[PDB]
Design a protein around this nucleic acid. Structure first.
Lengths: 317, 211, 317
DNA sequence: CGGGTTTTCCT
């Protein structure tokens, strides 16, 4: 598997809006409790949801996949990720619905072969015989680091006007600037593998042949997220991102690193990686770290400089 | 009767929506904890033939006792109910006898999320041991069933409805069981409550009450 | 694509304004999160919005399009970019509203053959069958460089009077001086290309004929932004501008150069460009640099002298 | 050593 914790710095930003009130567009915020000597304070802090990141990742994967000739669904060629959910979706693509429970695996293989996104992204089909497939990529909310006794995040309202020669023209937009952190998980070992018990159905050999290419494409799609091509309102409110700290761990067993909420979260995850490998009888365990804010690292870790090096090293192994 | 303790560090919080407007729960139900435990062995499969119907790859761990409690402060917010408690700590206690200590420890080191995909949770430390059964008056922090009597002052008790393992099969609703939570509604925290009970396991001083 | 990062130095400036209090006219300000040796801090700093830059760019595009014989819409001929949002604009221009979803492509092509501004800068129509077209040029707020521990910017208020022979006449104006930075993105591979999915509609041949001229005009329109013809209050508060550093990159794949916040942001973006071309299986990657402050550049980089040479080189390729 | 800024406007 691949696990990662990443720390970002963003300025003059509005990527995730919410329900509009009057003539105002509001940012997405969540409540947090901060501890003080006097007591506790409740503060509202901007956040970015976990769905925009998934949409950006899926779009990048579609763009990369169509270049290498891998199959892509008809409705997913257009950036409309409904997937093969209801009968109307199946009608356009041209797949017969599953007959019964015993035939579910065949339907899963057919869907998996007719669309890469339905494989990596996962799908759910509602009906008499539902079929399930959990996503291979796990992403969490982007929340600024609650480090120390101060929250480094702000949120202001800006006033904008449209000019006209015959007045008879005003709107407001919320802008922010925070220090974001998020973590993610990916399991390249389960790519191109069906997820239902039964007997092998004709057509799995094509999946075995396409496994390597699908894994390579899925790994390549992480470059977009780690480079900052997510969110909205980029036409006039293009943000200004920057990378500060990054820890990525590759293993052969379940594991995740510490959240990037403390100033020292690499030493802890290295020690816990050592202990987990010791206890779970693992064989492979590698850690790559990119450091730009000068925090303590530890020993026994390869130090990179950019994200392209990280992607190359991830693909090689 | 063996027991194990696990310490989890949460990333942003957990979210489980009530069955049947989408309000959420305050603390994860035992079904979620049992599923998180079972993930360590059944990783990669989403449908197993139970014998009559495909319901879940978790209908086999249904006889493992589990409880959990908070150790920090958080807020419940609807904006799809969520419980924000970033960088918090969750302490989970597993009591069972089906498998030996080695298997339970191996499965305990293999927990990745609680609830939905976004609710990732790291693991910091585990403990394994043998528990003892008592029936005297004890003080506890973990939530228990409705039928358990109470001796202290009713000031920090809430009522929730959970489901049994019967709900593990799709297209079917689990039985409703009442539960009592010793939690302060705002801000979220845990408080100690003294109970008499009949069965309580000592897992290191923090007695766990089951009935 | 064409992606750029630009650094400007402005003195005694008042280009973007906000609501007034009393006899005082205020300058737009925003909060920024900055990293110092002592941690992370929050500051309030003057900024210039991105919609002013978009307005200047579109006005220059209107001028060039009228000069070169390309069609320009009736309302947009006067510098009023309501485009085709409301029904009054449609009635004035004389275009029928779409009937159903299948008619959306016809409406988009019809609007797109009358105004180059709608084609390049996108538009939106809300109704029974909404029609969207994302802008093909992306801008952001103009922020001063967040370098070191001290922000190089200052803001103050100034006193002014109006003379009269019969007293019965005093105002204040905020004036700023700073080192601004901003970045931009322009994808010319989608200009003069319909975006709504559907069948072929008569009139696309004319678009194919005019594509080359539209691309040429769109590239030429960047001279205004790269020169400094933007902002208001230029009649009495004409600013003193001077370019300091510029990096422009031409690629065949998505890419974003580093923000102009650190003194070393030209070497880093060139190294990243090389590695990204290596990893994404690209086929074209060129970089152009304008340097006037003697900072590190690198090796094997084309070095220009002015902005006109850059515009000519962009046009020729 | 005496002397230490006077008005008329403040959108």
């Amino acid at each position: 598997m691949i696990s990662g914790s990443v720390r970002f710095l963003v300025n003059l930003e509005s990527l995730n809006g919410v329900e509009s009130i009057g003539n105002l567009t509001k940012h997405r915020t969540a409540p947090v409790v901060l501890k003080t000597s006097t007591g506790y304070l409740v503060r509202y802090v901007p956040v970015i949801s976990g769905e925009a990141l998934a949409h950006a990742y899926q779009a990048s994967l579609v763009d990369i996949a169509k270049k290498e000739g891998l199959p892509v669904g008809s409705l997913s060629s257009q950036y409309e990720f409904i997937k093969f959910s209801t009968d109307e979706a199946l009608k356009i693509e041209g797949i017969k619905e599953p007959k019964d429970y015993n035939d579910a695996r065949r339907f899963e293989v057919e869907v998996m072969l007719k669309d890469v996104i339905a494989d990596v992204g996962g799908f759910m089909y509602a009906g008499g015989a539902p079929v399930r497939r959990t996503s291979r990529i796990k992403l969490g909310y982007m929340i600024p680091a609650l480090r120390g006794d101060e929250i480094p995040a702000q949120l202001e309202a800006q006033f904008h006007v449209r000019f006209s020669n015959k007045p008879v023209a005003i709107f407001n937009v919320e802008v922010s600037s925070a220090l974001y952190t998020f973590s993610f998980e990916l399991d390249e070992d389960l790519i191109a593998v069906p997820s239902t018990f039964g007997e092998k159905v004709k057509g799995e050999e094509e999946l075995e042949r396409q496994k390597a290419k699908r894994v390579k494409s899925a790994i390549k799609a992480l470059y977009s997220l780690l480079s900052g091509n997510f969110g909205g309102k980029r036409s006039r409110f293009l943000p200004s991102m920057k990378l500060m700290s990054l820890v990525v761990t590759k293993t052969d067993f379940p594991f995740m690193p510490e959240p990037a909420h403390d100033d020292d979260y690499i030493k802890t995850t290295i020690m816990r990686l050592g202990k987990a490998k010791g206890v779970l009888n693992g064989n492979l365990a590698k850690a790559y770290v990119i450091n730009n804010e000068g925090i303590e690292v530890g020993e026994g870790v390869t130090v990179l400089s950019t994200v392209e090096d990280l992607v190359v090293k991830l693909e090689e192994e | 009767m063996i027991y194990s303790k696990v310490f989890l560090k949460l990333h942003w919080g957990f979210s489980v929506v009530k069955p049947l407007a989408k309000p959420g729960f305050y603390l994860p139900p035992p079904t979620t904890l049992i599923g998180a435990l079972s993930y360590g062995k059944f990783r990669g499969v989403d449908n197993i033939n139970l014998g009559n119907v495909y319901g879940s790859p978790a209908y086999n761990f249904r006889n493992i006792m589990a409880t959990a409690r908070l150790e920090s402060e958080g807020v419940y917010t609807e904006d799809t109910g969520k419980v924000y408690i970033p960088n918090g700590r969750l302490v989970v206690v597993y009591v069972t006898d089906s498998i030996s200590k080695e298997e339970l420890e191996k499965l305990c080191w293999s927990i990745t999320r609680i609830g939905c995909k976004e609710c990732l949770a790291s693991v910091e430390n585990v403990e394994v041991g043998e528990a003892k059964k008592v029936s005297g008056r004890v003080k506890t922090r973990y939530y228990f069933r409705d039928t358990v009597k109470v001796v202290g002052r009713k000031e920090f008790l809430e009522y929730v409805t959970f489901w049994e393992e019967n709900g593990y099969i799709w297209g079917k609703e689990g039985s409703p069981v009442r539960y009592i939570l010793p939690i302060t509604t705002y801000p979220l925290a845990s408080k100690e409550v003294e109970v008499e009970a009949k069965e309580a396991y000592e897992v290191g001083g923090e007695y766990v009450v089951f009935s």
